[model samples]
Target: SAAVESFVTKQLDLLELERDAEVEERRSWQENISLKELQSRGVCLLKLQVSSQRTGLYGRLLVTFEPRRYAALPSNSFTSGDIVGLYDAANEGSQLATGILTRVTQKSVTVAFDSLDRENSYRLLKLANDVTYRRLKKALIALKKYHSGPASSLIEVLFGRSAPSPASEIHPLTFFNTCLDTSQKEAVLFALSQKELAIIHGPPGTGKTTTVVEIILQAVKQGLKVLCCAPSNIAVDNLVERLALCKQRILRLGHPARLLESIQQHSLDAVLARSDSAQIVADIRKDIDQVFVKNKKKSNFRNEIKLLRKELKEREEAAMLESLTSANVVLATNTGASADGPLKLLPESYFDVVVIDECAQALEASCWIPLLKARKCILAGDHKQLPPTTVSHKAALAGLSLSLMERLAEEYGARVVRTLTVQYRMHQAIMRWASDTMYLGQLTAHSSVARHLLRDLPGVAATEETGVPLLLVDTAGCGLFELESKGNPGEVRLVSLHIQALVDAGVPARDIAVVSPYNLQVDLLRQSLVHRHPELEIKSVDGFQGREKEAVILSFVRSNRKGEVGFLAEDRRINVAVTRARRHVAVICDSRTVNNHAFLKTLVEYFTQHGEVRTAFEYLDDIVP
Candidate 1:
């Protein structure tokens, strides 16, 4: 308060004054989020399976492993740039030290902290002074005078000025890969036509990434420089993996530890490692350790080694510069876009166009980090699925939760937006409710997927509902209600039994996904099925939003005597829940409790009218714990 008041009375830049005030509010919220909250729902790396630990400079520890989430309870909360409070899980979860997430990939998450422990717990955090926050603050200052090539037009559109006019559409819209549908081609055409700023609104399963890839490919064919960024490393790498199928030169920029091993060949460090500098740095490393082992004090040996390393570091940085300069398309996570290695090395207008995938899930500040790099900008994502997650209630109140994509759609009508209406995922019957309610019936399933059904799989039973693609198991009067936000044991047994039935009917465990809305319910499901059917995917609804499975078994764990649905009543949550399966979608819930809520009651009736709703005993048999 004093610094803020004093700053207003005295001196400070706008970015600094506002950043300090905003960041301090966020920091206060971070502290207020209890360890219990993180563990239970707020999410930290609760179950860290640290495969290895090593000490670095200044006795800092680098911990790496495929950490576990509490059944997708807080999936969105944990990411590469989050600050984490390491806890000794073996000692009643006492705080040991704080760490920053250095990397997150499909296989592992890496962390750097001052100490290490074997039995570890992690509380995902957002510190005021975190590097992402600093980069965001820096971006605010840069955007002020950032009127580069087409950047002026983008600013104009964002400022609610007259929007961009359509240019001549590129001939033969998509050539990179020829599988694009009508709406996808329209998206590619729209990106090409909107000269300064373009928006692609991808409803779930409409091949959003595929469309964005086509857009990038089109830009590159015209010899335009491109920088593509997603909020998370997994997303950036996912695009890398997709783009690898093409013949274009693509450079993925990020820390070696954070990027996926499969895509390492495309990374800048891979080029550096392949060069002579790898051995030079390694030999220099050996030289320094020898001095630390044997020599007396005050020989100036350590200082000389440090100097040699600094020279090699600059040399590597130069190599990275040349490497990045040569690539036609560059991929980076939003925060990684500001890394000193490449973003700083490359000129501000080095990239002619920047495409932000998953922009809906990214902070507006984080988006701005890469925003200034290019003259023209293309934003792509589904705003209806999951918004940017901010743990601070105050943070959301301060408008940090609303994303750039969301704001553009709300502020500027149809000028900057292009919507892909067809979904290639989920059956039309199952996808209808969201399409009708959220998208105003604008969403439609592709013809190929309109009639998909689990019965399409060999050896599956062909019951009334199973004959179609949707089923709801009612557990109301059987006394299988929720307790303490935990799942119904009987319903758990039913899910296991149902899973067994699916597998026994020839559905592979890998093709099945067991999802629940509650974290504890997902935990119980994971515990029950992970050992024997480890191949079976168990995730929370929020955790499984962007993915799909052949058969989805959803457990709506809000059945209670009081008829309270808690957050389950959110249409967004329900929209995410019912859209995760391509073929079979089975829901298990207590009709009595859920019927109290209009949405849940409507869902039950919709399934009954469209597919089938059956009693729990129909599938329940003698259960063994």
Candidate 2:
């Protein structure tokens, strides 16, 4: 136990160091934003006085706003590399320009607009700070105190040699309103019965969220208070949406903008909408609005606005606490449970159970924020998918990206880990490749999805004799060129061509998706195809992880003469890319380049053995003719 405490203490120290380094890095960048450096960088906000004229690829504008109006704002209020929006005050509902801030000064800020229209006296708005980085710092602070405090059983299970006994013996499915498959029910039961910690290893398409919902439902039925969280707002909202379907009394804690509109009814704001606190805040806002309208020339207008804001903050905090106390299940992102977030408002040990979805993608320090709040914890995610994203190479090398789920799984072994094997998302043809190569053939497709097939379009030909709706387009000679400094134009063009073929064969654009490992590649594909097929979804592999479409076209963009797969060398990335397709999958890559890598080499061999490999020309000849 002492050793466990020491390990936690060291980990907390490392997290704190990383947080400080990140802050220092941010500060260094902030210090570099001088007016002299900004002009050279070509990134700052500019005020438009007269009509704009074309200057080569960009638009030029004259200054309009008075020097006094811009001088009052702080020099560092806006920064280079920040996105800024321009709204016309004179024209209602008119958006003037949107661009990136490249320079800022007392007189004006410079913005580099990609495209420009009519210019006017437009007000600039900077996009709010993405709090993901800030949250990491706060989470580390909370984790330090948590590990230093009285040790919890869950922490003991994680670090101590001995394990806790099962807490419940009842079948987990009996508490749910819906029927679950055998594997789902088994995972649910394992989580419910676990004494301290339960690890639910859900692979892609295996209904991880569905199983998590059942665990929460069962826990609540046993009269346990639950706190559910994930690493991202989307992940947390997804869990809330599923829990809401079961009619659970849930409270989602986060900014209204970051939360889903569908589940906002379950949010603290929505719960307090009809409460006295909300009414009081609303009345105060009304007074503030009237003050602005009736006292346009009043000298104390700023003071009145500040007083109203203070009152609103006090009332909202009281209302949030009341709603958090009353809810059976409180849900938030991992960062939202940190010291700087709403979790600090609730008392420790208030929650009996903490269910974390997508735990494998969460930093260990981040998970501790919510984990320290409960006696029992359930971590559901596929480590075989993406791990926590770490930007600092040094930090990642030091194990910052390693998640608590992964660490615990390695420590506890299979006894505490339950794997969900049956998936309902991919066709057998699509699933077989991933299962054999990645899961060692342990993964099976459900009957509903196993034999699923796409209609034989008149122009598109199915793969050889296997009749499987899958294809590997060999882009051997399609030269790769960098598009606008980021994307591979060759892959983008090939992906667009395949999507066109799919559309020509009677597949609706909505049923298809174009996925790549690079955001720039996805952006290029989207920009090129938006006019032709605006309904189609284009995303990076991580974006498509928890989502699925009827068909998926994956563009592997790491084609080079050296035969390197780049980031695609990771087997997990390929596994996620291949498993997202339901009825069909088309992988477009340079066979020669990818074959140099063993993983992609085996994939090429697998496709060849299955008679699914073809050159782009051969595929077109067979399909078009």
Candidate 3:
């Protein structure tokens, strides 16, 4: 009797500890409002009188706020260069203008409108709301509760506290129409057999998405409903495309325009195309349009349109919610699982499992939104590539950018982690540096992509031998130059020349991508090549993540006489840039300048040692080995 009483007391004490933990976590989430959160909900309307209007290089307006309104305005409410919406409140908040807030004071603010028009009423303005950020804050509170509760068996297994024997082996290819490699098969089985949590550490070009598709199929094969999510629409669409290839019944949630064109048909709207509610909503929309056309000048046209829109939205959401319940797999972005997203319509913990692709890119708070709704969770991402993007440097330093995957892996060690070693995207030479530097030398190139080499084509220089695919275009003689308005002209010109050579050698324009770390550099290169090579892809390193090209030409835009590499020093950026090319990679930089940074120094030395370094003139020469 005493033993039973003690056991009950211990159980009660654990419950009390969890309750206290939940309260503390919730308080922290509420106190930490990010700048993004502030900007989303920050807005104010003030009564003001125009002081001056000037027309010159740009139109400017000076207005002094009314004393009563000025007194109510918060300090630093508006900042210089902040974009704001201007409106005509005289006509029920109709948009009158939009402008950049050039200056703000307690009593006056100066705005530079794009253009001043004769019909500008300038009566009122409404600031845009950060609905997504607000939703995330609420989701953060929910997340605190979920994690503070009794640790799930999945969480224990993932944390390596309990070791469950592997699930009985099943042929992974049998569940899918396609075949999977041995590593992929192991990952899928390990994930499915787990009691609560599994982490699949997929490096760049390691078939992470392909592995995710197999995991989904296996879960669905066992008659478990799966909720798939990613941090962005692009990631979600990518998953949808791969899952669709496996011929699974999927319900993709998002605005149709934001979804991929190829996978648009799998969207909830398309799935409900012939449903009664869909037709009713469609007919109502048509009627609303007719009413607008027929009653453009009517006094009640606005009210009529508003009512019709409300009705249409309600019917559409109802239909979508009904369809959501019947699907075997539901796919959405991380925020799409928040209160503002489709998940708000379903009961909590309705799904059997939640699979987060690109888990490394999502904030821990964002990931927890969907994780709270599933019985089990799987995280598939490469932590070594990129962490979550944080705008605030302090927040990043304070661990805001630390993703759940990275944190969990750090805590649990190897038992919960599985590495996908075989890469199918990059040539071995190009893959070697990234593999060694980022992945701790664990990566191996598949034979198919490993042997591929860059051959000399017309307008290109000859290589010392065949099968050489990696090159360092040594622009050390041409030092880096800063443009007053644009980026470095030297790097842009060199990259342009290389693209021309690649195209001349028979690489399609669409198959080539020119990536740089600086946005200004990409802008400059894009402008220069717009008319000349309209189809060539150009983007920042962040844009090139999760994407590949037949040939990748990277422009390291940082170069100085002091050999400083600037932000290009990040090894993650280098990892992403070099690994994007399947056949060829030419890094255009000032070898002497880049050699100042340790990562770049090692890379330059490697290229030089391998005889892959050449000057611009030498690259154009046709001398044989």
Number of the top-ranking candidate, with TM-score as the measure: 1
Residues 231-320, candidate 2, lDDT per residue (tens digit)?
Answer: 776687777778887888989874322234567677665677746554654645455345446445665666765665566666666777
Reference-based TM-score of each model:
0.80, 0.77, 0.73
Q: What is the lDDT of candidate 2?
A: 0.69
Model 3 gets an lDDT of 0.68
Give a tens-digit lDDT track for model 1, residues 506-582: 77889899998888899888878988797999988878868889888988887777777887877777777888888
TM-score of 2: 0.77
Model 1 ranges with Cα > 4 A deviation? 1-129, 144-150, 166-174, 256-262, 276-302, 339-341, 459-466, 617-625
The root-mean-square deviation over C-alpha atoms between each candidate and the true structure, in angstroms, is 6.5, 9.4, 12.4
Candidate 1 is scored at a TM of: 0.80
Of the pair 2 and 3, which is ahead by lDDT?
2
Q: Choose the strongest candidate by lDDT.
A: 1
Best-first order by lDDT:
1, 2, 3
